Design a binder for this molecule. Structure first.
Ligand SMILES: [Ca+2]
Ligand SMILES: [Ca+2]
Ligand SMILES: [Ca+2]
Ligand SMILES: [Ca+2]
Ligand SMILES: [Mn+2]
Ligand SMILES: [Mn+2]
Ligand SMILES: [Mn+2]
Ligand SMILES: [Mn+2]
Lengths: 239, 249, 239, 249
């Protein structure tokens, strides 16, 4: 097998194995603030940020035809000053090695429009806090699987626990082609899960970079934090 | 840290690191049939079986007061020739080192009655296929957490997909005390999850044996199979890496 | 894969996943004293003790014909009150599941005489502190690989650092059939290693228990401790 | 912990998680050829090549003062068409993130002259095939630990088995500060080991890249290949299960 793994049980203000894009930064306290937060903890609108692990991950192989299994865990908080006006959300994603931030707000930095496009070569699990009816978003905050489109191929309800840390596990099984995403809140004891088959071979290039992307709302007051506290990842591509 | 881990990607007819109790047996195709199945695949009633890893696991420590985190993963099939009449279920459990099967049917081999009692020292994640009203079972098939009682402290719905393989992950984080159980059907793409705080230190002994228990219905016709295809486990009692664990096997 | 692993970063007075045989006991400070040691830390003569992990391990498979790879590490101390007169030593071993101690002294609890016998079905890496010329022991304290006989199929010099902790790694790769054993003293910065091809399939049964065995001298004054501080083990048997 | 690991069970022509410097290339057969080899397998003189994992590794931390443990294994072959005339050798090394190849030949791509210099911030385990008396090289092919200097702090004898694959394990325990390097020939059943205390915190930056460096001789005829077949690495900087790291890792 070809394998890659890492663990950040915290982040550090100097973190050269993490490529930070847009407004993403690591605080002195070890938290990866994806979108802008001021000194009092107040999130800011019109914000887009991304963090990706610096080394490319081999996700499938042309000669053999085999695809990697992977698993990734992370712990994150979304705090909203007013839970009545929130946006836009965060996502864990795989994309080409040279990927740059796309459109912000509803596009979660990952897509440019409503339309499905094979050229994005982007698979993402989204944690979506704002309904874009333009994107067939469901009437509730939700988890979705985004395969070359911001119009999720599947979703499920996720009830946000304001300002509480959420623990996420995302897994992908090569043999079954099943992507599974689960979110638990230890404080509230609530838990949510989604599963769907996704063919990585037809969507991603052989080599990808993985990380996070998050956006705050375009309008004043539609603001929330996207704080990652910890992150671990492991892939295995069998020969 | 004290650590215990194992992986059975199949089972074997001769499997001395697994203690079989009741009707449980491994077939020559490597399937762990917890409950009686005849030669044609037809499950039998009045059945009870258990399988437990032979080595005791250190789940908490009185000198430190620390408790283990663990994770376990397994793949299992429940097949019912008639989906209108199914019973009683399977469970993954932690119990004292010397535990033996208790009562069958709706008690799942793990308890003797409806009543809660600390002396069981049993914590279990059930996949319960029959509504026992005197156990306060909900109106549907469900996953439940049982802490010294067959009356689950919490449950959620699980739609059994008849005859299809179900992948389970159960994890326990001693830092948050959160037990989480999830089940996914790759065939159907359905998925289910339950989470709850459980204090192992007050409810288990320091040393446990872990494994599976299953029962078929005490009425002729209320039958199904309880076939475990594979099982991995890892425990970590500090004086696991979970993404690396499911991935590693 | 069929896999078994465990780590004892120390030992406990109540340890039911360790089967203790002979004089072996765990102290209140978490030390596995394989052979008798009195209250002042003075080792005693005529002692023999073993500890094996309680779950049998699948080491090879009859249907596929495949053999397990394994790796084990442990930290141990041998303390002698008089390093002019020491015996007999200690060994890590694999043997049938129902194995019970055999003869003491230079037989290390693992064999009954000098002769080779396929019926032992035991493979051991010995750390031997007394020359039995009767066993072809080399003239120096040594590491040996014992395959169904106390006459090592191969040995190498091991210089005992009296009362200092030794870290051992023993690995078996099933693709190459190579058994490798190394020992290092962090205190003296000395290191020793031995390698040989060993066919486990033809010596061991499919299922084995693993652990340690040790013995002190038959003669008065020929005494040393055989204290194990920590031990970890991982096997992997592929389909 | 902050952890970084990878495994290359072979290499590929497109390998963007490796950084190739100097003459290093990977062949269609998946072999990392650190120094020039023509089409017939014949190594070429005057060659220097390196390969390093593309992600920086956190090796120690100035806030806590902790240093990482790490462990690495690799399989390599050195083939000389004339074992009487060989040079210069190869090395696994940790250096600053922006590090680039230094002087060639017996400097092994890692150092610029014989003298020690804290500015190198380089720690290496060399597999040295040519005696440079100016560097105090022992009169035999050897394993050595190089800490900011080509003159090893410690060495041990290593008898090159020409054309045969060598399996290396290098470990660093941060609690004891003991670096250990072992090398074994499965084909020959020979083995070699070296252990020393090295304080990483004083020699390396908090962040490093790690990899391989190799050089063939300056004079025609002093030539050998430096072919790496596989490489895995794991580090752990606490705020590794090594037996699990040999077995898998
Ligand atoms: Ca949205
Ligand atoms: Ca029931
Ligand atoms: Ca002897
Ligand atoms: Ca040299
Ligand atoms: Mn959405
Ligand atoms: Mn129930
Ligand atoms: Mn001997
Ligand atoms: Mn040298």
């Amino acid at each position: 097998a070809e394998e890659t793994s890492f663990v950040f049980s915290k982040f550090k203000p100097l973190e050269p194995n993490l490529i930070l894009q847009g407004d993403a930064l690591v605080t002195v306290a070890g938290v990866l603030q994806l979108t802008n937060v001021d000194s009092n903890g107040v999130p800011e609108p019109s914000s887009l940020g991304r963090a990706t692990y610096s080394a490319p991950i081999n996700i499938w192989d042309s000669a053999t035809g085999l695809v990697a299994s992977f698993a990734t865990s992370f712990r994150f908080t979304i705090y909203a000053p007013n839970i009545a006006t929130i946006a836009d959300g965060l996502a864990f994603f795989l994309a080409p090695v040279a990927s740059a931030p796309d459109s912000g707000g509803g596009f979660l930095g990952l897509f440019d429009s409503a339309v499905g496009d094979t050229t994005y070569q982007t698979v993402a699990v989204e944690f979506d806090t704002y309904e874009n009816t333009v994107f067939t978003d469901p009437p509730y905050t939700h988890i979705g699987f985004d395969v070359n489109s911001i119009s999720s191929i599947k979703t499920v309800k996720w009830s946000l626990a304001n300002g509480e840390a959420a623990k996420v596990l995302i897994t992908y099984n090569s043999a079954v082609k099943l992507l599974v995403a689960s979110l638990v809140y230890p404080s509230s004891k609530t838990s949510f899960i989604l599963a769907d088959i996704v063919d990585l071979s037809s969507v991603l290039p052989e080599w990808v970079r993985v990380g996070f992307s998050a956006a705050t709302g375009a309008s004043k007051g539609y603001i929330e934090t996207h704080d990652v506290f910890s992150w671990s990842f492991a892939s295995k591509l069998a020969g």
